[PDB]
Amino acid sequence: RYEELAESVEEYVLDMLRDQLNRRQPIDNVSRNLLRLLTSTCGYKEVRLLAVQKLEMWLQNPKLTRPAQDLLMSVCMNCNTHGSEDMDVISHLIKIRLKPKVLLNHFMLCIRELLSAHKDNLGTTIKLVIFNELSSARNPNNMQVLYTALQHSSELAPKFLAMVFQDLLTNKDDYLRASRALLREIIKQTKHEINFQAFCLGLMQERKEPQYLEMEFKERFVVHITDVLAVSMMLGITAQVKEAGIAWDKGEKRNLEVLRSFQNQIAAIQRDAVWWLHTVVPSISKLAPKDYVHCLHKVLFTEQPETYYKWDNWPPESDRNFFLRLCSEVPILEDTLMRILVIGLSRELPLGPADAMELADHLVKRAAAVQADDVEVLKVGRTQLIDAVLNLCTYHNLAI
């Protein structure tokens, strides 16, 4: 009804909104009528920023709890343009802190609405929350905010989180220990309801921005990526998975499905990492043969245990043996096998045929050590694996 008068109406409203908000008032002097007016006028990003500037104290005021909640939800549902004002509003919202349990629940629902308002809200919120976590202004709501974001988007939230970890690793400073502790605790509060495979895929995806393409610690970045992948591999084990592994060690077939699904995810992640090493890693950087072999040993969990914890000392001494055994005992894939053989035969890739075939032997033996009737631990359809293996012995017709 005011399409022609939109600009004039908006400016005229903002005039008195600024006047009322700037007028120095005691906390009790704020009017629920004014809060309702702000809620109705949240359609403007400027109004949504002015509200979120003082929204924390408005919520803290018990007398304004319901109107302030209405204002918050209106701001969240109107924050759909993903502008600079929207980003600032998200920053203010994450700065807000709420003591009450009911208020926290309402805040979490409003955050769900905010994320639904615009798709990039998820990535922006994840970036801001992780920046706050890295900084000293930790909000006691950051962990549950990320939990709710993961609930809302079990995949895109892991993807955004993975790219943000890539941006932290590319940063000059060594964020290895901080990132390890960060993901550890995040998983702890989320109770492990995160798609580890999706997060690993997000980390695996190559970055095309000039900041990455010109990174002068590309080799260190790849090494740190491998390290954090191993840490995520560790964290994939829950208390329930630990119980299932104990039962399997004792021969009990209880909750074996959880362990089998976990191992399937582990094998898929390992296959993805091998594919990445084979294809993208040489493109990103040209690692030395020793470093490349070390990374392959890490991803296959054939590396020495010491290097895994030499940085942060995590996991504790007790957990290392159990976790290493459980992660090492996993099934194999035909794709992994053929990729290993191709990398070994690849002269340009710094992997000797003897080393590649030895690693294949070790991995095949490890998978065979996972003898299970209900699991296709060793399934291969292609017979060209035999030909590749035989070629690996060829001498440069004589074979070693």
Binding site: R24, P26, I27, D28
Partner: protein, 48 residues
């Protein structure tokens, strides 16, 4: 910073405030020196 925070808040410096309507309000001191008075002692103690 404390001085600025109180000035922002509903604190009135002793020079402006009416000398008469002073018994009701509660006096506020900072590092001993008297700064002013405030009508409601509550709602700022907990806030601080």
């Amino acid at each position: 910073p404390i001085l600025e925070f109180l000035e922002e808040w509903s604190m009135e410096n002793l020079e402006e405030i009416s000398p008469a309507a002073i018994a009701d309000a509660t006096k506020i001191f900072v590092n001993g020196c008297w700064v002013g008075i405030h009508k409601d002692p509550e709602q700022l103690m907990n806030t601080l």
